Amino acid sequence: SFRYGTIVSRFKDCAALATFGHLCKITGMSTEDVTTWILNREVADEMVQMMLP
Amino acid sequence: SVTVKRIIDNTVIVPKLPANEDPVEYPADYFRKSKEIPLYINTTKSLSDLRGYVYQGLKSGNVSIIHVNSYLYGALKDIRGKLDKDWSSFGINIGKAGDTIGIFDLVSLKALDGVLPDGVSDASRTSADDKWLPLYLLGLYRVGRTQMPEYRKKLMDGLTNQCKMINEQFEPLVPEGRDIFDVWGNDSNYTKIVAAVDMFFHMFKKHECASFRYGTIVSRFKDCAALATFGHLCKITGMSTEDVTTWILNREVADEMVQMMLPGQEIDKADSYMPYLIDFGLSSKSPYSSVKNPAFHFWGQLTALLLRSTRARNARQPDDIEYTSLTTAGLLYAYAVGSSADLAQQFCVGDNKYTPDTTNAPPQGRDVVEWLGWFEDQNRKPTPDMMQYAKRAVMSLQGLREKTIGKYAKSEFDK
Amino acid sequence: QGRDVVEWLGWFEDQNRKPTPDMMQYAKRAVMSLQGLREKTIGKYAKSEFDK
RNA sequence: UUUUUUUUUUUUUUUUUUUUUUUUUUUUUUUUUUUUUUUUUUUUU
């Protein structure tokens, strides 16, 4: 129960990652199939940055 | 239907929903086990004292239900009522030729031994016993049934009925909302007293004390609304019980009808135990309720409405029935009766009219097969003419309540 | 004719996988004249989607 | 320097209750919030 309030530290300012998950569940597409619909240079860039191994 | 399979990987799934027993219980199938109906009149001590016990108790406070029961049995112990011909129901004999049977000529049996105040109360109250006090105690069962501001409009008609060569006043003061005298409804023995009062005076309509009936009337056919709606449909369509039966066009309405028309139930009998099946504790789940006839209730009451019933306006819309399928059925029936007027000459002066004298034109009369054939040829979809009939029927209905069939019907047909 | 999935899917095919204008009117009718409905319900969702 | 759901987790998710019911229906009645004595412009000479 100590989680209520301690929960907003989890993925704190990792919102971009969260919208990638969300975009998948809405389009219902695979993670890779969503990746292939990225059509702007600076959106590809950010994706590369977000996915570094 | 048995086997269903997931097509992606050829594996067998079995679809299943939770059980639902809670089955019906017929009047007849009860007297198969017991021959009597137990009336547990607890205390049988001092009848004059009880009159004061209930009077002072009702005058704001917690009057015991055990008390009033003991009172009512004492006050209504009039062995009046000259039996006209013969009285028998479900095998139990009650009357013969010229018998002088009273109102409690079904079982009495003594019970418990715990009483409240002890002995002689306040000798304050005169006779005026049987004259009005029993009417009131029975009259609170009528008022107790409801739960909307209609109470302070049905209790108003209680007080004005205790003046028939009487004229007194009132008793309690607290608003209802289920708290005061509403406890009594769930009393097996109290309800049994009310049901035996209604039954006695349904037979002895001419009797002086038959005024007790109004207040105890709401027990006759309690939880038998579906049966009432079937009668109403016959009256409003003008068709016979057989014809109406043939106009059932949904599988689950048919089932319900069959359930209701079980052969050995004495439902068409003049003076039977059947209408008091609930309050005499003969049944824990009426076969005849709206709850157990939801498809039939909706279908019957929707048609009734399209045909210009004023009752139906305010009927409850049930849950978990096929509204779409049911509604289009009801429409066909109403449209058919509303088109085909009966209209035949009845009287003459040696001068009669004889009836024998375009393509998508509706059938001549009110035969199901003719209309069924016509609906097929209409692509199994309701015509513009019948949709316009349904509109005209529902528009200009005013102030219809939430969750009624009237609200459903205006909303469906008058966009 | 009936209520069979294979059959209705084949008819949906014939309508290049997009809902018909009669279908849209059907759902329109089914949702218009729904009264006060609260936020984040499938009621609110359906009226927004089908009543415009 | 931030962060950028006036999002947030623990299950959950009819401002759903099942006890039976369900016309804010009771009709014993009886139903112009008609009534009789003419009369029948809130007409006058």
From Swiss-Prot, chain B:
Main localization (coarse): virion
GO cellular component: helical viral capsid; host cell cytoplasm; ribonucleoprotein complex; viral nucleocapsid
Record has RNA-binding as a keyword: yes
Keywords on record: Capsid protein, Helical capsid protein, Host cytoplasm, Ribonucleoprotein, RNA-binding, Viral nucleoprotein, Viral RNA replication, Virion
Gene3D superfamilies reported for this sequence: Nucleoprotein (1.10.3610.10), Rhabdovirus nucleocapsid protein like domain (1.10.3570.10)
Top-level taxon in the UniProt lineage: Viruses
Region listing for Interaction with the phosphoprotein, in residue ranges: 349-383
Gene Ontology annotations of biological process type: RNA replication; viral transcription
GO molecular function, one term: RNA binding
Location relative to the cell: Virion; Host cytoplasm
Chain positions recorded as RNA binding sites: 142, 151, 205, 213, 285, 316, 401
Family statement drawn from the similarity comment of this UniProt entry: Belongs to the vesiculovirus nucleocapsid protein family.
Function of the molecule: Encapsidates the genome in a ratio of one N per nine ribonucleotides, protecting it from nucleases. The encapsidated genomic RNA is termed the NC and serves as template for transcription and replication. The nucleocapsid is bullet-shaped with the tip containing 8 turns of a conical spiral before reaching the helical cylindrical trunk. Nucleocapsid assembly is concomitant with replication, therefore viral replication depends on the intracellular concentration of free N, termed N(0). All replicative products are resistant to nucleases.
Subunit structure as annotated in this protein's UniProt entry: Homomultimerizes to form the nucleocapsid. Binds to viral genomic RNA; this interaction contributes to the virion assembly. N in the nucleocapsid interacts (via C-terminus) with the P protein (via C-terminus); this interaction allows to package the L polymerase in the virion and positions the polymerase on the template, since P acts as a bridge between N and L. N(0) interacts with the P protein; this interaction prevents the uncontrolled aggregation of N(0). Interacts with the matrix protein (inner layer); this interaction contributes to the virion assembly. Interacts with the L polymerase.
Name recorded for this polypeptide: Nucleoprotein
